[PDB]
Amino acid sequence: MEAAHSKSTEECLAYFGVSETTGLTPDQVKRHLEKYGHNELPAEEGKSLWELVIEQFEDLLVRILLLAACISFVLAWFEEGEETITAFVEPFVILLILIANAIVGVWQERNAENAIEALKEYEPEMGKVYRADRKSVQRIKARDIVPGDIVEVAVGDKVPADIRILSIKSTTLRVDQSILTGESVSVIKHTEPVPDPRAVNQDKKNMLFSGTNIAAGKALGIVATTGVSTEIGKIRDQMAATEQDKTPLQQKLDEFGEQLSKVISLICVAVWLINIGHFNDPVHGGSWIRGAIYYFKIAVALAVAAIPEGLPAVITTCLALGTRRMAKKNAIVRSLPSVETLGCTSVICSDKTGTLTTNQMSVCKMFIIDKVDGDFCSLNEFSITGSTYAPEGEVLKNDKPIRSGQFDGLVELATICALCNDSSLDFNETKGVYEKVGEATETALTTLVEKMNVFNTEVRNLSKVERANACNSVIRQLMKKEFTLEFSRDRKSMSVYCSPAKSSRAAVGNKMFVKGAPEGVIDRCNYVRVGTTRVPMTGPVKEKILSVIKEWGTGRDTLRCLALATRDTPPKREEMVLDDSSRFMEYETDLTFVGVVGMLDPPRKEVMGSIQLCRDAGIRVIMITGDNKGTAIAICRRIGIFGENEEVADRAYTGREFDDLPLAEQREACRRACCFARVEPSHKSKIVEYLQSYDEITAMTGDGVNDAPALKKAEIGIAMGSGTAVAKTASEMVLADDNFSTIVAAVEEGRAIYNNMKQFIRYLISSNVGEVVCIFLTAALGLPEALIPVQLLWVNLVTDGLPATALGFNPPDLDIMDRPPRSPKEPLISGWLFFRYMAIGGYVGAATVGAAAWWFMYAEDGPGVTYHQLTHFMQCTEDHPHFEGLDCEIFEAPEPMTMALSVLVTIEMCNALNSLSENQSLMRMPPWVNIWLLGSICLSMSLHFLILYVDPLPMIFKLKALDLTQWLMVLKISLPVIGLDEILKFIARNYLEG
């Protein structure tokens, strides 16, 4: 449609041709679906493989190197047109090595973007529509919404498409349009038409814009526009870069990598400078042109291989993989930078019901008054069996089943439960189980009555479906629920007014039924029903009731119990004002106590240990519960948040008690508070605030609309997977399973991921340092180039190709959850770590040039044998009164080069094994822990032997296959890297613990 705001409600129902009762028909559905398309934005093209490789070849250095290799090949004809083959082949080698080194990059970024995207797969946008199929609400994918069908939205929902308001089901509707209108404050809506069709968004107060949130209320509506036609869809074809922020980890990494980039460059120009006195040499055509080019290539090549390339990418790759793992474990990472923070988590405020517990509500116990005589007060305690919402169980007295119908007290009890209820039961057939229809509390109540059957009604001759609300129905048959004085936290209770069914002229026959917290309900009682009788509420009676309530709430079941009461002489049907909540407590007085139900929702099995794990990890857990202070502390003891016997007077507050503290004392409270009971929505925010004023990194749970403020405030917002859409959008992470344990897993993932990122870094940085100390050590000591450009770029293609990416599959480190939470202040690369980097790096470099020097200086079973002055290998042709039976052309033997290469590669596979754990020995963390890496070591060694034995290759690579003896030497020279890092590890492990 168009200008649906300008039209009236009917003019819209008309335009599409649908009643706000029927909803759309499978036909119109398929029709609109084809005429309009799915409700979504156009799945953008993207980019091609071809294009990205090209974009890779846009590097100055890459161009430079490649251009200079073309010029020096173009000058391979002019001075002495001799034998070239390899001199022609070099340029084609480089550009192919480079090509394959870039293709690998695409695989990484594709893989990166992929996982990040693939998270939305876990949490798709839904909607509430009315259609022809069934009469009731159908939850569907927002993309499957056709402009025209009838939509229903409620508190905390996200608007699936642009809707024209049909009918406001609640008394007021409020909407958070912040995302579009910009206005933070929630705007009210109506169902009337807006005049001016040339009007603006902020003026369309009968419209709901896709991507907005329902702050308060419920409404019905008809879809006007979908897809790009949306008021939001017409803005997402505007900005492409809606994210411009850098996590302080990449920021420090781009700082560090930039520092290396600079130094690497300097000692890269230095190499081309300390060789000016050799530009003229004959072996370069004797020209400053070919002289200054054979070293220029070396310079640019080293730089191309040693400059730490996609260092930020390493974080991107690492977050990618962590992400998918967390999601696998039911932790949906909304905001990416959050994971970095997740490691540093130091506090978790979790809600109790449903997160720490199952919210599998069921009535375990219940008592009524047995006999009262002055100081004599007997209770009729009962237990009920079966913890599922299933109306299958039995009512036992003293461990023997009884007929609850034979207890007048229980008849009233069950009457109040059925009539103070707004929820009911539903037997599912596909699943074959009964399940709630309303709040779990009330549904447990419904189930209670279905087990009690105070009227001995039939059951077995009823279908599984009729069974569901059988005894409840019956109870409603007797009384007529007129209206309900719903619950308010100010009085901690609720009530219903009821009139008998079979009564013509009754003036005294109406009753009020009350249900609520024991505390106050009992205080508003002057009579204690005894079967059918009633007596005065004595002090002792009140004492006996209370002690049993206290018993059960403190027991090893920590029951949340309700008091049930009736008012027998209710004030006039008319004297009652059904608007102000302040007058309800006034009507709900002069009561007769009936009984008490004790109900249970058990803690999740895992919670127990998960808590312990946080203790070990140095992470404080703070429970936030709606139970009273008593039961609340009890539960904390019961789940290990508190010791069995330890003192907690200053570590557990009610909302009230908190508010009674002055501000300074409240801040004080949060440094040690572990339990909060009966709080206000605002308290979440303040608690976070205070927690922050201590430099704590806090994770805060929430799921409601009034949770959003505190969730956005917290460092890690955690919304429940079953909670409001408002909550989720405001949080940085969603619990698929609402499980507290999951949150703890999520934190462990943060730590782990942080470690794997360190693994990658150590390996790259260090291998590159070595890549440079190599080519510098040869230039400095004047030695024969131990590696040529083609060889170096090859080694580069293998190292940063297979083992490196295979490190992505490192298992989690050991001490991971036995450390205190990392500070988000401590730097990424510490001084020690940098020492570690240099040591190892510098060592591989020296081990490479020394492998080459081994074939000369100390040359065993091989040519050269020039123990000394292998240094000045230029004054060989000219100044040869020093040569003794040695051909000058030996400095171009393909054996030292094959030594260098055959050691650097082996030493990298070793260094890869060193990068399994950040500190743990290969004897405490064996190499076969990462089979992926071990497989990568094989493939790498496959390629090396092949480039040495397949005749075309070793020729162009200036390499010759080596003898078993010389291979043993390679090992005798590489393997000490493992030992070096092992020493360093043992120092970092036993001397610098943290």
Partner: protein, 31 residues
């Protein structure tokens, strides 16, 4: 799901292929 193994095979073939194109390309100027 884990496309883990596809990751090591693709990076084993990109360095397999470009080496096969070295045997090949060197001989087209040899002849």
């Amino acid at each position: 799901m884990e496309r883990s193994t596809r990751e090591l095979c693709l990076n084993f073939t990109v360095v397999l292929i470009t080496v096969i194109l070295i045997w090949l390309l060197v001989r087209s100027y040899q002849y």
